[PDB]
Design a protein around this ligand. Structure first.
Ligand code: HEM
Length: 116
């Protein structure tokens, strides 16, 4: 599915090709950008703090755990997605891998069955 790998500062290091389709951002555009360019406010501005809370407390809030959140596409549109984070380490520094599963279709179907 879509996969994003960030370092300990929230900077994107690898943006798979499906992520490009899903978010709109190309690989070269994504890499180097902080992951918070993928979420609306208030989380955008506080996403770094969330990561900082975890790097100092060593207390996992959403690691392993799979969570449903709102992603933001390049054209400004938000959408729900399921995200699962796996923590890793390379060259001494920590890295984080996110596996996104688009849920837009599941949210639309649900709204539709609601509406009928
Ligand atoms: C793109 C939509 C995203 C949103 C809305 C989002 C939102 C959040 C929120 C609200 C928190 C804190 C949750 C809590 O402490 O209970 C958090 C933590 C974090 N997020 Fe995200 N996130 C997004 C994507 C990502 C991605 C793609 C990565 C992939 C590496 C990632 C990695 C992290 C990490 C490492 C933390 C800290 C985890 C922790 O405190 O346990 N996030 N995120």
């Amino acid at each position: 599915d879509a996969m994003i790998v960030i370092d300990g500062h929230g900077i994107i290091q690898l943006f798979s090709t499906a992520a490009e389709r899903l978010f709109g951002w190309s690989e070269l555009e994504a890499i180097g950008q902080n992951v918070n360019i993928l979420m609306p406010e208030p989380d955008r501005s506080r996403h770094d703090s969330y990561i900082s809370r975890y790097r100092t407390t060593s207390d996992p809030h959403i690691i392993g755990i799979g969570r449903i959140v709102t992603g933001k596409r390049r054209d400004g549109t938000t959408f729900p997605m399921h995200l699962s984070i796996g923590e890793m380490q390379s060259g001494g520094e920590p890295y984080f891998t996110g596996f996104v599963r688009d849920l837009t279709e599941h949210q639309q179907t649900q709204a539709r069955l609601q509406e009928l």
